[PDB]
Write a protein that binds this ligand. Structure first.
Ligand SMILES: CC[C@H](C)CCC(=O)Nc1ccc(S(N)(=O)=O)cc1
Ligand SMILES: [Zn+2]
Length: 257
């Protein structure tokens, strides 16, 4: 099965998922000088006041904080998007070292980690239908750098001990994802894909320019998670990122000058 090791990592994925070599794969390097300001882009609208988190799950590749997406409760709209996208889950990708971990890069710079807030287009009814459409998902990407702690992340950090291994979940209600956002909603946007198998080409990526800062102790706790299940040999969940993929026939647009 696919993963992030030498024998099953990103360079292998194309054998089971040929779309890995497709025309709109993610992540990509964001060349800031080549991205073009698009004055017709609208401000993002991030409406998370009614978000209902439910659970946190270690799925063997990352941990997902899952939300109730059976009503319009936490939605993303505006920006490059037409229509309304509902928050279903967020997760991160991170490194074994502070100098790597992000999936997107900015002028080839790697951040310590990257948060993905995953949303699906309500016109398709459910997430499984949405991933089969070119405009099915909108993923809000936010870079993490190591410095000061992010207080709004701490409730996530502190539950990780309870979901150390693959397949473990824990109740995780009343978590407010607004505490994970930077001040500015300036962003870059481009059409892309899921960054893990099945690598479906269904995502409008919206990547915030401003990173959030997290403490070294916060990211160290991410790195204590396990890829393996309980009672299997311990493999630390680190370096669960896909490297930048060719941009091909795409233009990255900026919301800002
Ligand atoms: C049918 C599709 C898939 C098996 C269903 C499970 C799923 O949601 N996968 C997923 C979600 C988000 C990302 S990312 N890293 O934000 O692009 C990567 C993978
Ligand atoms: Zn992701």
């Amino acid at each position: 099965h696919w993963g992030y090791g030498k024998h099953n990592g990103p360079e292998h994925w194309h054998k089971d998922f040929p779309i890995a070599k497709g025309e709109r794969q993610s992540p990509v390097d964001i060349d800031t000088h080549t991205a073009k300001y698009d004055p017709s882009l609208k401000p993002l609208s991030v409406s998370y006041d009614q978000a209902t988190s439910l659970r946190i799950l270690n799925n063997g590749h990352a941990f997902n904080v899952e939300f109730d997406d059976s009503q319009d409760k936490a939605v993303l709209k505006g920006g490059p998007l037409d229509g309304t996208y509902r928050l279903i889950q967020f997760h991160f990708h991170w490194g074994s070292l502070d100098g790597q971990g992000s999936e997107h890069t900015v002028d080839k710079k790697k951040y310590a980690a990257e948060l993905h807030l995953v949303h699906w287009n309500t016109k398709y009814g459910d997430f499984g239908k949405a991933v089969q459409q070119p405009d099915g998902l909108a993923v809000l990407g936010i870079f993490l750098k190591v410095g000061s702690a992010k207080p709004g992340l701490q409730k996530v950090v502190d539950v990780l001990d309870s979901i150390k291994t693959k397949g473990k979940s824990a109740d995780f209600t009343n978590f407010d994802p607004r505490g994970l956002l930077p001040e500015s909603l300036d962003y870059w946007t481009y059409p892309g894909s899921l960054t893990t198998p099945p690598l479906l080409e269904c995502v409008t990526w919206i990547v915030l320019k401003e990173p959030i800062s997290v403490s070294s102790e916060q990211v160290l706790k991410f790195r204590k998670l396990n890829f393996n299940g309980e009672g299997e040999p311990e493999e630390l969940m680190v370096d669960n990122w896909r490297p930048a993929q060719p941009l091909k026939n795409r233009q990255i647009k900026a919301s800002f000058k």
